[PDB]
Symmetry: D2
Subunit: 407 residues, 4 copies
């Protein structure tokens, strides 16, 4: 009768470096990377927790955590312990020694709350999911551990940690990036790919992490140490994302993105410019809370022979002034100033960027606050572009202020 | 050394009906009228008080006040009394027996004011759009020894005819007060201008309390500052004028001191649509004197479709969050939060209030569209003046105000 | 799988006058009355809604709602609509509009409710003190297929005479409703007990809007849930009782399910003073079902003087913040925030509301002192029944309610 | 006309170890130490900033700053940048701060976007009330490079201070660390100016000064030892008298400033709040001290028979305290303290959530946060049994921590 969420604590692992994002994550953690025009990546796991009815949240951070922590302080500031809500920011010769460690080192903060269930979450994915489903499967299945999994074509699973299960979705082995991924019994050509989401009873986990602290062998991670141990010595069960996913009617399939490369990151944002986007950012039934300030509305100015400030097939945030600049298939975060005779196409423009007059840019991700010099051309000369900026094989240039200065 | 604002309470009169705004205020007070894409009118006086360092605010409401009051409860909710801040929402009888006037609006609330014991009271009109630093006006008030300091616009005399006008001597001491003078008295030194009352009054609090008690005890008083309290002091006390230009907070992108009454639909339309200029008279992108309001986290603005027949786009326009511009042409328009403009529609010279829906093929020009209106598909406005005058409120200059009740009546 | 509370709106009827509480409610509505040292009565229904996971709450107020509305504005200010949460304060007057009854209180505000489109409405009285998890009642409602679920106390029949009583069958289906039955029908199989309505009702929103629109067009209706809406469904539709015992959130340290009307001065006094017990019926130190309220940061409680003639200390008492007990003796008393009790004074069996000041040498016994009352030096209460009755509101059991207007008229 | 606080930013140095406070700062920085019953020491500087009209605040922290950082996030969370308000918590994002100067230098990246005119450098480990608008007004007028807040102290007590030589217009002509013969004030000998560690700068000037300091690989990167000694000698340093800006309540007999540097001083400043006429008026609503506070139940006193009586005399007691058959005298209790039957506290400062077991009897103590006092424990009866059981000062105050109690089998 009583929702299990009332007795759950969501614990967000937010230390992921986002290595392959290169300069995008040079001074910010992957979960602090901007997404969608208004939010950051971590706001999704956090909003899922909130919307699922989980009132206690812990967030473990590791490297380059400064701006991630300031985001959390500014945006996620409305929890009060007298309402049995909490939001603890838990930063790391003093780092965490893995994903399991960050729970272990913080037991003293967890146990006063004494939650019945722990919902361990990866904070660097973009998805919407109602965790109450997973909680209910967990208590009703008697599992030691319930693991959230995507169903992906066997070929795609080769990059995931893959769970080998049986006909009752109990997990019988785990393999990191199996090159020939174990298929679902009775449904080959599909594999169960781990989402980095783990539901525990709280007391089992506590011991499970104590045990891990003691063992010299352990790399102190959930994926390699905690879980496989459980898989081999206890009862592990799979939960399928399709069962819990909160998809809008206007989302043609369950949405989940890792945005683990500049290409995947650029594509995921630019896809929001579609007539029918994969992600329905207008689904008010499952809203994404974030840090946002009061801003002026977007402004478009100039319209004559040679210049017209306008956006077409584009998404534009507040505090943006589009002055004689032509935008197409671009997403602009808050605060962008684009000036006369400049042009943007296939552009993901992060907060507070200035585009100088006459600049022309195509297929780019422009980093936070970058000032684009007047006249710069990107997307015309693949080879000059690759020398000046971080350019992908697909031809997306990631542009940072450091890159511009060296011009 | 100490700023006087620490010792002041701002008391905002927010019962303005905005009668000439017609259907725009049939269900809301004038201070609750939307402006500029995000805020409401009352947010300017409150942001002035905040930015000036005043920590205690009272707001007296009168007619049609629920949405104003809701706005205040939700947007102005961050003042804490044990930090010596306060924000009091004060409707007629206890959050018949209406306020009998603006002075009554204070008098009835003496028991709210007195516990705070502020040293000064700043009486504000909540129905004007303007930026002002009240600390200068406080300074002048104590340093001049006046009974009342009155905020005054310095306007050419032909404009002052619709204002309450203060007559000036050499030292800017007010020597009489005229309500809407046919030929306004001028300022000594430079004739050609007049001092028009802003409805801003600074008192020593104790002085003010005695006045409103005296006004309450006068059986022939109409119970207003403008008509009753102020004329009494101008004569039998010391009234002094403060010049708006001296306290006005101008951005360096604002060519002149900005103050707007938006007392008519043309004025309302004109003040909003002027924000679409390359160089508007009001700088809303300024940060050195910010306007706080009630704002919700919204998805960004979206523009879509780009084919032969339809292009979602905004030109020389201002567009807010949660707007979806789908195959619709926007030109010289101001869109508030939550507008959904649909394929093949067109908007020119439009002020479009929150949550409006523009149906496919609809074409609207020179309009103000009320909050939440659902424009039916294919509707045409701005083309047939007599038909346009027939179904909607239409001004002499050709502006159409459109409400849902007007749309509901549509069959011809 | 999905908790029904996500889909419910709580609607709190906070218009109780508390007539029998006499002077205690001469300027405040009953839901605004102080309870327990810090909170107000309305905070129990609101905290129940919040703890049950209901994110949308409306409060309908009626008479003397000034201080109630103020409390709700400052205390219950943390709901944000973009997180699908909302807190609407819905005063009977945007004067002329008064709600015609508890049913009119909803009907007039349909245009506040339907935009949120909740699936369930939970109608609550805002003037009782109790803890209850409404998810239990929601589930029963959807499982039972009923048109209304009604929350009911299980009370011994001779105490049931004072209540609105539902007749019940073996399936807890309500076959009749009786207002104050001289002989309350017992529960089948459990005579000796009867079901008393708590004035708590769960509906599907679509059904409730239907019923409310039917009621408004019926000119004979008293427009109340109690007299009109519920009895109509009882005879013509499907009403089922829900047992408070099943939903009540009882602490380990509460010997039974706790519910209190505090309808009389004696009952009010009794319910507060009971908190000074070694083992109170109400466990306020519970953290598993917390009661939220408006609270300010205050200094701690202070106890001073210990000489031969005066000692400030409290025995068998509960004392809040900002209290200074200066050479004063407290015994079996409950003090709200900001009480100043001065040298040589004594309080016994006293419920003392916020900001009360107790003058030197005063000695008060068996009292309720209203908010902000200054007790003059040397006043004696609880010594002479006839004198105390002449001066104050004295109950049959000898409880004196003391208000400042009673003190003002005094001099023996 | 325009108050200078509008253009100022307060930067609070909150990395003090409070080394002499021993186990009381075992796992927390000094600014995080509880004071007065409901607040922490850092809240005083912060409330001074806010009350003075300084709506931009940064806090630099160093060692053991977890609870300090949590307190700040929870309690000081009401600033919004779009109202030109900001509160930045700046932990050491290797590379600890090199000193209080380095604490500023690393965070130029945080400061410049706000571009304030003035920087008000504040020690976050003192208890005092001050209106910084006076010191700002003096600084801009004096035309000096740095203005330094100073206590006026009798020279006999100035020997334990950083003392500023002054001339007849309060220009600082020397700074001496703990002078044996502290230089006296011109025409007011017998009083010396003792630095409060409060400095006012122009922001541009301070950025240069901290950039120069960072370049010198020799420097100890501290305002006290490096930057301030450089300005007196080569630039323009001027003193600001605490008495000139202190916010002294009518019920405060003298300007109040406390360092609470030692266990005895900490105990003394807290227990002094139980006085009939305390030196610190914690009721002056005119200059209020904001902190992190939760809604809690009122304090409760229960039991009253021949053998036990729950009550407090000459005491200060917070919310969520249950005094159950326990007798308190001259004690200050923070939130959530449970004292059980037949127990007795005297001259006791008891930090939050402490449990006092039945029959326990304690005198002259500071009990650390959350400590559970075993039933029947006696402290303050036997000085030598106490000094080996707990940390006991020369004056006879016992600091009791949980790790000390856990060692008990004598
Ligand atoms: C807060 C941002 O508001 C906006 O004006 C848009 C366009 O998103
Ligand atoms: C805010 C907590 O207040 C109290 O209950 C006491 C006694 O300080």
């Amino acid at each position: 009768v009583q929702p299990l969420a009332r007795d759950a604590m969501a614990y967000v692992l937010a230390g992921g470096r986002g290595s392959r994002l290169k300069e995008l994550t040079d001074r910010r953690a992957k979960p602090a990377v901007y997404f969608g025009g208004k939010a950051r990546i971590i706001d999704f796991a956090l909003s899922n927790a909130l919307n699922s009815g989980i009132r206690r949240i812990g967030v473990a951070t590791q490297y380059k955590a400064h701006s991630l922590i300031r985001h959390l302080q500014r945006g996620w500031d409305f929890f009060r312990p007298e309402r049995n809500e909490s939001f603890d920011i838990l930063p790391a010769t003093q780092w965490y020694e893995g994903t399991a460690d960050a729970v272990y080192q913080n037991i003293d903060i967890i146990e006063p709350y004494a939650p019945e269930y722990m919902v361990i979450l990866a904070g660097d994915h973009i998805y919407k999911m109602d965790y109450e489903y997973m909680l209910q499967q967990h208590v009703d299945s008697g599992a030691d551990v319930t693991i959230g999994c995507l169903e992906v074509p066997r070929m795609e699973a080769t990059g995931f940690g893959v769970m080998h299960v049986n006909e009752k979705d109990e997990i019988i082995d785990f393999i990191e990036k199996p090159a020939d991924p174990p298929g679902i019994p009775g449904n080959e050509g599909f594999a169960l790919a781990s989402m980095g989401i783990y539901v525990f009873h709280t007391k089992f986990l506590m011991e499970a992490l104590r045990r891990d602290a003691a063992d010299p062998t352990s790399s102190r991670d959930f994926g390699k140490d905690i879980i496989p141990y459980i898989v081999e010595h206890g009862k592990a069960v799979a939960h399928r994302f399709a069962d819990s996913c909160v998809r809008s009617d206007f989302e043609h399939e369950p949405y989940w993105r890792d945005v683990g490369t500049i290409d995947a990151y650029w594509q995921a944002n630019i896809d929001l410019t579609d007539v029918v986007p994969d992600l329905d950012i207008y689904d008010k039934s499952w809203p994404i809370w974030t840090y946002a300030e009061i801003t002026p509305p977007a402004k478009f100015v100039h319209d004559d022979e040679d210049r017209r400030g306008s956006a077409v097939s584009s998404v534009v945030s507040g505090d943006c002034i589009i002055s004689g600049a032509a935008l197409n298939r671009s997403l602009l975060f808050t605060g962008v100033r684009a000036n006369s005779y400049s042009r943007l196409e296939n552009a993901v423009v992060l907060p507070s960027v200035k585009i100088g007059r006459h600049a022309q840019l195509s297929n780019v991700v422009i980093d936070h606050g970058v000032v684009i010099p007047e006249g710069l051309i990107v997307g015309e000369d693949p080879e000059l572009d690759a020398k000046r900026f971080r350019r992908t094989e697909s031809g997306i240039c990631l542009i940072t202020q450091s890159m511009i200065d060296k011009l």
